[PDB]
Design a protein around this ligand. Sequence first.
Ligand SMILES: CC(C)(C)n1[nH+]c(-c2ccc(Cl)cc2)c2c(N)ncnc21
Length: 271
Amino acid sequence: KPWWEDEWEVPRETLKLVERLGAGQFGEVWMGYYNGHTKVAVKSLKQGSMSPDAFLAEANLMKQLQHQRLVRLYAVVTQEPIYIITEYMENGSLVDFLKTPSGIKLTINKLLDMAAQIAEGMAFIEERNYIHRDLRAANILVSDTLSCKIADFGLARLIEDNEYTAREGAKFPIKWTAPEAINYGTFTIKSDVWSFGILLTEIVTHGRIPYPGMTNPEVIQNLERGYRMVRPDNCPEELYQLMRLCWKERPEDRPTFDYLRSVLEDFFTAT
Ligand SMILES: CC(C)(C)n1[nH+]c(-c2ccc(Cl)cc2)c2c(N)ncnc21
């Protein structure tokens, strides 16, 4: 709907930007307050760095994916500089949070709980016919109560028919991306499941880079031989066998996110 009839447009005066949390080529991310009392995250577009329409597509996607386990869109300011205002996650990125003194002291029980929260969020995404395509610990946000939410929906896509095929020059992080997506540009919810397998290694190693000691060409070569990532240090064998299900050669053999959530909750309720 036009911005004047939109439930999301908001006068820029309602916002006060307080602390820059991040900055890059396409903009910045700040902690701020909406109408004085409500803490929010504000992502601002660096004018000219990219299309305003491309930037706002992320917000438009978040409008269609609302759930307690996904970072919530709050508002948008569609005049330059363009802003996307969302739910503020106090403990920031999971990949960074796991490295802090609080994250380091987490028991395997709580790491499993978090893994299950993520699978829960991905099961909602899966049910809505969407895919994420950038599922990795960097893209999981942590709340002040240590609950986890899926974030960074920029590459998310509604799957009309079974699969989304990227553009021929599109590049993806090799270590987190399913082989079919790397070799063919082909993404399905099963590609996200592969990524989730990789995300579980990030969780159990407190944020270490997947495939320790290997370059991308080595990872590709090992995968093509039928090998998968070596068991991470201190990883419980039950969890490692769950990651192996996520890495099944055929996409169709990989489990659903609902199956994963359910097994992960059992693992948690036992430890
Ligand atoms: C990068 C980091 C960890 C500083 N970060 N990034 C976002 C975020 C905000 C708006 C959009 Cl549209 C997408 C992500 C964010 C947030 N909500 N809460 C806490 N930290 C956040």
